[PDB]
Amino acid sequence: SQVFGVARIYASFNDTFVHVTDLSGKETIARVTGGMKVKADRDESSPYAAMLAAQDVAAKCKEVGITAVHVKIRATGGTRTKTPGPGGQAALRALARSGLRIGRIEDVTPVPSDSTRKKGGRRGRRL
Amino acid sequence: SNIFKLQIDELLEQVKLKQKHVLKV
Amino acid sequence: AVGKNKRLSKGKKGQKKRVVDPFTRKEWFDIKAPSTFENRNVGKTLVNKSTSASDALKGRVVEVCLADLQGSEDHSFRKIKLRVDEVQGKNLLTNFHGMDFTTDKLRSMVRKWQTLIEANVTVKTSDDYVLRIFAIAFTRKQANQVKRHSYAQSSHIRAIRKVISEILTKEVQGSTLAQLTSKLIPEVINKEIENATKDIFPLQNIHVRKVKLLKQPKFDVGALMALHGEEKGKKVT
Amino acid sequence: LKEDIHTHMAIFEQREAQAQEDVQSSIVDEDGFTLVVGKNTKSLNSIRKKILNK
Amino acid sequence: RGFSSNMSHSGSLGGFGTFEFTILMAALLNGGGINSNKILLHGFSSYQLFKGVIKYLATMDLCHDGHLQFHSNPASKYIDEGFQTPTLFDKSTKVNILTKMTVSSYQILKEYAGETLRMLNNVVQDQFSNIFLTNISRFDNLKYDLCYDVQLPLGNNLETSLAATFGSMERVKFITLENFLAHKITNVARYALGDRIKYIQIEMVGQKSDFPITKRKVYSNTGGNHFNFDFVRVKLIVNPSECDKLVTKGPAHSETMSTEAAVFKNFWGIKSSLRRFKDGSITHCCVWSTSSSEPIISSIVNFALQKHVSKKAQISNETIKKFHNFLPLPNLPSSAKTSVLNLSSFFNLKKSFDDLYKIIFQMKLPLSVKSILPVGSAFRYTSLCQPVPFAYSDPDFFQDVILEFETSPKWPDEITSLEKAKTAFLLKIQEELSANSSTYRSFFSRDESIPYNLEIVTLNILTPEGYGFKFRVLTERDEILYLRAIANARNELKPELEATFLKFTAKYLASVRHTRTLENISHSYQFYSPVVRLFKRWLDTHLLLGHITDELAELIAIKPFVDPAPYFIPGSLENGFLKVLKFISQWNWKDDPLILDLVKPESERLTLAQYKGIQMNFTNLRNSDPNGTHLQFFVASKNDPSGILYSSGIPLPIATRLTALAKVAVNLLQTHGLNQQTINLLFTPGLKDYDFVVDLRTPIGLKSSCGI
RNA sequence: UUAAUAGGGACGGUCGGGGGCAUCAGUAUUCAAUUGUCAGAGGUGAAAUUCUUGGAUUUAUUGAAGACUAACUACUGCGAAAGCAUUUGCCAAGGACGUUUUCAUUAAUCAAGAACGAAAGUUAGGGGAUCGAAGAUGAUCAGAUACCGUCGUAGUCUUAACCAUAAACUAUGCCGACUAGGGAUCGGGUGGUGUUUUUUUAA
C-alpha cells in the first residue's frame, strides 16, 4: 500500500532544484525550482522559493500515487562547497509539511578525491 | 600447424587409390 | 524569475502546449529482488505502455539499502544496486549490480591520529562475472597503549595490503556472485581479514567499501529464474 | 556422546598444558647448554620433527 | 556427415557433393567477396583452401539473405539479395548449382561448417580425428534428437484425397509426388513447431533409385509403381530452451484480422484461439499440456500433420516414451503432467534449506559461522529420483552440507580431538536449535567414508517441510593434519595415507567446487539433468554404482554436452543417453585421457599450458601403470587437475564392465534398430556371468517410501 | 707503534610522501551516446551579454580526453637545496643502527670551473580537460558585499635545448672542543615483563 519515490534535492548558491523520481531514477515524476515560484533572480536561492517548489511537487506526488520518498540531498560539490545550503534544508522541511512520508535522508554531494583548479585564482573569490 | 599438415598427408596416402585398378578399368 | 519585469528570452518564442498528461500512459511495474535477500519486495516503477515497455525496463538499475531488504538496522550503512534482467507479468526480476555505503558513515569512519589502509583488486567469479572490490581498514591502539596515535609503518601497510588482496581474490574466485552476495550480507569477509591481519598489526573498522561489476557474460534466463526460485493465459470467452 | 567428548577434552587440555610448560621451562642439558624454544611452540616432539624435516 | 550430391527434395539429406564442393572453390578462387576480392589464393595449401570454404559457407548466407554469382567461362561477387533458396548462380551458363540443395538441409550444412570452423580454429585440442575420421551418419538417433515415422494411408496407391491434393499445378512445380509430399511435411512441421526446433529433416525411408532393364520406372513393394517409398520419417533438432513451452505464441490481436493472423487461425483451427496474459498483451495463441512420458513436440506434430497432411496418418515415436518412463516418476502432486525438464522438486528442496540457512546464521556460537555450503546431489540436479517430502527411504534423502567457521588458533592439533571438537560444535547446533526451533527434529550419526578417521559424527536434521540434511564441519587445520600424517607415516604406509587424503578432499574440498560448476553449467544444458539421472539408473540396474562414485557418473555423462564434437549438443533424453554409451564404447581409457572444459557454450577454458600439463600427468601415471590395473578412467578438469580424484579405487573388473557393456549395447543397436525390444534389453541385467548370485527381499516394500 | 667519540671501505636487518622507467586505482571537470520530464538555466549587492521548446538546467546507464592524489595530513618523514603524498614491479642510490670485519691520516677551509636549481619566460614538435596574462564583449545602477559576467590567446602538461631569478630566511660563514635541566616524537639496537598474537609449512 506504500509506494516509494525518490526526492533528489540539489541546493545551489543561486537556485534550488526539487526533483522527484522513481526508485531507479530513470523516469522523472515532477520537477520544480525556485525560479518557477519567484519573480526576481535574487530570490531564486531564497528558502521561501524552496518551500514553494517543494509544496508544488508534493501535491503532484500525491496525484501520481507516490506516498513516500527517499531524500538524497546534494550541493554543487566538485570544486565548490560540499554541504547543502539553506534552500536545501527548507525544501526538506516543506516535504515533511506536505505530508509525504520521508524514508531515508542522505547527502550525495560530489566529493572529488582530486579537483581541477577552481575559477577563483590565487587571490580568491566571493569578495 | 605442422602436426595437422602431416596428419593431412597420412589421410591422403591411406585413402589414395591403388593405381593398378586405374589401368584395369 | 517569473515576474513581468524579467527580460524576454528567445526560447520563449516556441513553446509546446500542454495537452497531454504524461501519466495517462505510464503503467505501474513491480520490482523483486533475488532470493539471496530476505525481503524480495523492493517497490515498483513506471514505464510508458507498449505501443515496447520491456526494452526500457531491461538495463534499469535501482539502488536500495540492505536495511529494507534484510529488515535490520544493522545494515543501514549499505546500499545495493540491482539491475533488471527479465520481465514477466509486471514482476521485474533483478540481479545484483554493486554495493557501497552512504557518504556519512564513510566520513564518520575516517578520523585523525590513525592511518588509512585501502586495497583494491580486480577479480572474476567462477561464473565469469568480472568485478572490482575495494576494502578499507583502519589502525587502532591497544588497551594499554599510551601514545595518542596508532600509526603503522609503510612496511606494515604493504604487508596488510598484500593480505587484503589475497583474501579478496580467494573469496571471489572460489565462489559465485550469488554465493558472493551471500557472503557480503553477514560481513564474513571482514572477519577473516581481521584474523588474517591480526598478527601483522591490530586493525579496526574492517569493511569491503565498494563492489563494481565491470563485465558480464551472455545473459542466462535459466540461471536467473533459479536465483529467483511458464504461465498460461486466460480465454477471451 | 556428551560425557565422552567432555572427558576427552579434559585429558587433552591437561596434556597440552604440560607439553607447553615443558618446552618453555628453560631446558638446560646436563652440561649447561640451554635449549632454545620459539614463542608459541607447544610440544618438544614438534621441535624434534622440525629438525628431521629440515 | 552423410552429405552427397543426390537430390534432397525427395527427402534424403544431400545436394552438396564434391562438385558443389569443388565449384565453390573455383568460384572463390576468382573472388567471392562483396567487393569481388579474392578470398582464396592459388598459392594456398590444402589446409588453407579447405579452411576458406568452411569459413565462407559458415558465415555467408546463400539461401535467404544473399547469393553468390560467378562466371565459369568475371570475378565472383557476393550479392546481398537472396532468392529464398540456396543459390549459386553461374552467369556464363545461367545455371544455379544449388537447385538440388533444399532449404532445410542448407541450415544443417551451415551449422556443420560453422561448428567445424570453431574446431578448426581450436588450438588447445587436436581435432583432426573428429573433423575427418569420425562417421556421424551411422545412426539417425545420435544425429537427430527426435525421430517420428509417419505411416501414410492406403500403403496399392495413396488414398484418392491424398492423390487429389497433388493436383496439376504442383506436378509442374514438383515433378514427383515424393518431392511435393516431402515439401508438404516440412512446411506444416516447420510452421507448427516454429521456434521449438532448430532443424528439420524429412526422409522417405525405403526409396530406391535403380531398376531393372525390363522396367520403365522404379517399383516399390508398398508403392506398386505409384510412390517410391515405404514410409516417411520426421527427424528434428529440438531447441531445449523453448521445446517444452506450454503455449505457442502468435500474432497480436488487432481491430482488423491481419494476414499473419489469418494463416495463424486457419492452421491450428479449433486449437487456435485468443488469450490474455498478465502483461496485458492480447495475442492469438494455442495451449498444450505437458506430460512426463512424451514431450510437447509429440502432440504438435501429431495434430499438425493429421489436420493438414492426412487425417488417417499414424504418427508414433515409442523410443522416446520408453526412455521417459524409465526415469523414476516422483510421488508429488501432478507428477504425471510434469515435464522431464521441470526442476520444481529441486527448487522446493533448497527453499527448505534456505529456511534452515537463516536459522543457523543468527544462532550464537563460540565461533562465528564462515558459511554453510550445500554440496548435495539434489543441489546439483543429479539425484536419480527427485526429492520427495518425508520419503526417507531414498538413499539420497539425507543431503550432505559443509559447515565452516571463522579461522581460529584454538583448534585441537590432534586429529581425534579436532573431530571430537567438531562434534561438540555440532552438538551445540543441535541443542539450541531444538529449543528455539522445536518444529525441526535432529539426530546424530557416524561417518566412516574417510578411512582411519573414526571420530566423524554428522548431524542429521529432519526439516519440517519433509527433507533431510546432513551437516559436517570443515576447518583449515583439518587439511594440514592429513598432510602431517602422510609425512610422518612410514614409507610403506605413505601410499595408504595419501589414499585417505584423496577421499577427504573428494568429500570436503573438491566436492564444493563440483557442485558450483555443475549447478551453473546445468542450466543451459537442460537435458543434462535427465540423462545423467537415466544414466545413473542404467548403472544401478547392472550393479555398477556400488563401485562408481556418483561424481564420476556425472563427469562421464557431461562429456557429450561440453564436448559435443563431431555431434551437436544433446537436446533429447535418448540422444544424450545413447551418446554417453557411444563414447564409453569407443573410449580407450588406457591410452586416451578424458579431460573436460566445464564451461558454458560459446573465461575458464583450458589454455595450452594447462592442457599440456594435464597431458603430462596422464603419461606419467601410465608410465608407472601401463596396463591400467591401479587406475582405469582418467577424468580431469580444472576442479581435478590430478585426474585421479573421482576415479580411484575402482576394481579393474568393474571398469571393463562399463566399456564391455557399452560396446555390446552399441553393437545391439547396429544389429537391431532402436525399438521397444532393444530398449528393454538395454535396461535389464543378465546376471548369469557372475559366479554366484544371492537374492534378497526386504520385509516391506520401499517404493512408496522412496517417493516413487 | 695505536687504530682518533677523525675518517674511508665493507657486511647485515631495517627505514624513508629520496629519484628514473612502466604499471594500477581513484572520484572530480569537460564533452558525447542513450534516457524520463519540462520553462526557464546561469550569474551578481542588484542586473545585462550567454545556453535553452532541434528540450536548456537536473535525473539515470555508460564511454572518451587531459590534468591530479582530498578526507588519513600531524609544530611528523625523505632529500644538498629547489622539492617529494594512489597500488604494484624493475634499476640504481642513501641517512641512521649493529659489527670482537677492514685502510691507516687518506683531514678542515678555499679560486676558477661544474651540477642541480621554485614559479615565470625563449626556441622547435606533441597535447590541449580545468583555470587562464592579453584581447573582445555585457552592465555601468548602489560603497560592507565596489569590481563582477561570457568568450577566451600565450600559458597551465610533456619531449630536446636555453633563461638561473624568489621573503630560494636562523632576514645570521665554515670545521672542532667545552658550558643547564624535562619529557614527547621518528629510525636503529639492548634488557625485562605481561596483554594481543599463536599450533610441525616458511616467515
Short mmCIF file of C-alpha atoms (C1' of nucleotides) in Angstrom, two decimals, chain F residues 121-187:
data_model
loop_
_atom_site.label_atom_id
_atom_site.label_comp_id
_atom_site.label_asym_id
_atom_site.label_seq_id
_atom_site.Cartn_x
_atom_site.Cartn_y
_atom_site.Cartn_z
"C1'" G F 121 59.92 33.49 -19.84
"C1'" U F 122 62.55 31.90 -25.14
"C1'" U F 123 63.28 28.20 -29.45
"C1'" A F 124 61.14 23.54 -32.31
"C1'" G F 125 57.40 19.20 -32.02
"C1'" G F 126 53.07 16.74 -29.35
"C1'" G F 127 48.69 17.58 -26.31
"C1'" G F 128 45.31 20.95 -25.10
"C1'" A F 129 40.25 18.57 -19.82
"C1'" U F 130 40.37 22.81 -15.94
"C1'" C F 131 41.99 27.50 -14.81
"C1'" G F 132 43.79 31.50 -17.52
"C1'" A F 133 48.25 37.38 -18.62
"C1'" A F 134 46.41 39.66 -23.37
"C1'" G F 135 42.19 40.90 -26.39
"C1'" A F 136 36.89 41.12 -27.39
"C1'" U F 137 32.31 41.81 -25.24
"C1'" G F 138 27.55 42.95 -21.12
"C1'" A F 139 26.42 46.22 -17.14
"C1'" U F 140 27.88 50.74 -15.87
"C1'" C F 141 22.84 51.38 -11.10
"C1'" A F 142 24.06 51.17 -5.43
"C1'" G F 143 30.21 51.70 -1.24
"C1'" A F 144 30.40 46.13 3.76
"C1'" U F 145 29.07 42.68 -0.24
"C1'" A F 146 32.90 48.37 -5.41
"C1'" C F 147 34.54 45.25 -9.40
"C1'" C F 148 31.64 41.29 -11.49
"C1'" G F 149 29.57 38.19 -16.01
"C1'" U F 150 30.84 35.38 -21.11
"C1'" C F 151 34.12 34.12 -24.94
"C1'" G F 152 38.98 33.34 -24.06
"C1'" U F 153 45.24 33.90 -26.87
"C1'" A F 154 50.14 32.98 -24.83
"C1'" G F 155 50.49 29.99 -20.65
"C1'" U F 156 48.99 25.94 -17.24
"C1'" C F 157 51.11 19.37 -19.26
"C1'" U F 158 55.23 16.67 -21.89
"C1'" U F 159 59.63 15.96 -25.27
"C1'" A F 160 65.09 18.28 -26.92
"C1'" A F 161 67.81 22.65 -25.53
"C1'" C F 162 68.24 27.95 -23.41
"C1'" C F 163 66.93 31.61 -19.32
"C1'" A F 164 69.35 30.84 -13.40
"C1'" U F 165 65.87 34.58 -10.97
"C1'" A F 166 62.44 34.30 -5.26
"C1'" A F 167 60.62 36.98 1.75
"C1'" A F 168 65.44 30.45 -2.75
"C1'" C F 169 65.02 33.22 5.78
"C1'" U F 170 68.14 31.40 11.52
"C1'" A F 171 66.13 38.32 7.42
"C1'" U F 172 72.51 35.04 10.76
"C1'" G F 173 80.26 31.67 7.03
"C1'" C F 174 82.52 27.01 7.65
"C1'" C F 175 85.15 22.88 10.76
"C1'" G F 176 86.29 21.15 16.01
"C1'" A F 177 86.04 21.19 21.83
"C1'" C F 178 83.63 22.63 26.33
"C1'" U F 179 79.28 25.30 29.16
"C1'" A F 180 71.94 23.55 32.15
"C1'" G F 181 67.70 20.53 33.34
"C1'" G F 182 62.47 17.77 31.49
"C1'" G F 183 59.67 14.70 28.64
"C1'" A F 184 57.20 13.84 23.64
"C1'" U F 185 58.08 12.03 18.64
"C1'" C F 186 60.80 9.16 14.39
"C1'" G F 187 64.74 5.31 12.79
#
